[PDB]
Structures are given as structure tokens and as C-alpha cells.
């Protein structure tokens, strides 16, 4: 009577970082979504993600953002401590 079974079932998924919360704080825009600096600049808009700088941490923020910061002060503003690069994304 009230017996059931299933061959094959899942629920749709995602996979994410390795980002914490509040849309990767050094810009108000997502890591995949384009920052202020990128969108305003426009001269060539890459097919997936544009230009993201990965840290030793494996948490990433925009390249342009850390780069504008770097000129006055070498140190990274959110980390408040020094930043060296390590790994490149996709």
C-alpha cells in the first residue's frame, strides 16, 4: 500500500569559497561580481571573472582594490597587517 522508493534524486547545489561574509569586505561587490574599480574602468570585460588577487590566506579580493591601497601604504586595509600574494584563481 503506502511503500516508496527512489532510483535517483538530488537537490541542486553550489560550491563556494573561502570568503566569510559581507561580500568580500574591501569592495561592496562580490568576488565574482565586478568591483567599483573594474566596472568604471571598462576596456575589455573577461568572459568569467576579471582580475581577482588571491592571498596566502586563500580568501581573495580584487586586484585593483589592494593595488590602489598598496601605493600610499604597502599593508592591506582589512587585514591591517601585511599581505603577500600566493595562488592565482580562475
Amino acid at each position: 500500500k503506502k511503500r516508496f522508493e527512489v532510483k535517483k534524486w538530488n537537490a541542486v547545489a553550489l560550491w563556494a569559497w573561502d570568503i566569510v561574509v559581507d561580500n568580500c569586505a574591501i569592495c561592496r561587490n562580490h568576488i565574482m561580481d565586478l568591483c567599483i574599480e573594474c566596472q568604471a574602468n571598462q576596456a575589455s570585460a573577461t568572459s568569467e571573472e576579471c582580475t581577482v588577487a588571491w592571498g596566502v590566506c586563500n580568501h581573495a579580493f580584487h586586484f585593483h582594490c589592494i593595488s590602489r591601497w598598496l601605493k600610499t601604504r604597502q599593508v592591506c586595509p582589512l587585514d591591517n597587517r601585511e599581505w603577500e600574494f600566493q595562488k592565482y584563481g580562475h
Binding site: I19, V21, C57, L78, N80
Partner: protein, 203 residues
Amino acid sequence: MAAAVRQDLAQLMNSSGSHKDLAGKYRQILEKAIQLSGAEQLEALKAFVEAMVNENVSLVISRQLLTDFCTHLPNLPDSTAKEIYHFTLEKIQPRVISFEEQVASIRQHLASIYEKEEDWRNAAQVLVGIPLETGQKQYNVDYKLETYLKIARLYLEDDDPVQAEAYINRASLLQNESTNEQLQIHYKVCYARVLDYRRKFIE
């Protein structure tokens, strides 16, 4: 007596009863398991885990009892607890996304034995095993912070600055949302050491 627990579990195994009653019965068996001493305790607990990870047990039941099952574990001697922690982690793996908290809890506890016994690397590597940003479940700022910091501190003790710098960098971004002062002071002291160990003297 471990064999008797196994018998009792096998017999409940194919049941489709109410949550409160079914969980109450496993709870009684769990209490039976905990009052054993020797090889029986270890075995009955392993047997308990084998029954929980079976696909004929409801997820509601398994998540509850597995929380219950975790809190009784630190209270057992170190050898028993360590063995069980390793077994339970291998056995929880097929439905790991459903027992994520329980994996984390076991791993904080498993790491705490390794720290005490001065086997730093396993304690760190164990903590690295705890998903904190890549899971379904997203834990409070401080828990995550505590795990990254403990991981970093453990690498510093084992004289490995590179791993330490990775997890201490991951810790910094939580540190500012953290609203316990002591933990933020530990973070700074630890960071200062990570720079120390990296031969990054001036910073």
C-alpha cells in the same frame, strides 16, 4: 555485553517508529553502552556508531543521538576516545554534510587529546579537517576564529611558519567582527609570533 547492544540495535534497525519514542529507545541503549568498562565499552560504542551511520536510520534520529553520543566521549579515557573519534569520522563520511557539527565537535575533542600529548601536527591537521566556510552549516564568528587561531598556534609550536601564516591570515578577517577582547589579544600575540617565525622581523 557489547554483543548484546549489537543484537538490540539490529532488532530496532528496520523500525519506522515515532521520533520521541525511537530516540528514547536508542538513548537507553546508549546509556547501557556508556556504563560498560574495558573492551566492551569501546566495542559497544563502535557498534553504536555502525548502527547510526546505517541508511535505514532516519536523519532526524541520527543527528540528535550523535550530538548526545559526542558529549559522553571526552569523559572516556584518551585511548578509547581517540580510537572511537577515528572510527566515527570514517563511518560518518557517506552522509558527512548531515553530521557536520558532529564532525567539528569530534575534531575539537580529537585535537584536544593530540595537544595534551604534545603531538602538535595531528592536532592541527585534525582541525584543518573541520569545514568552516565551505559547508552548509556556517558557524558563529568566534568558533571559526578559535579553530583558525588554534590551527595557527599549533603550526608555530611544530616550527612551520608557512602553514601558520595561512591560517593566521584566515583568522584576521574574523578578528575584527569578534567581540571578545581576550581572543582578539591572543590573535595579535600569535600574529606577532607568525611574523617572528617567518623571519619577517621588522613587521
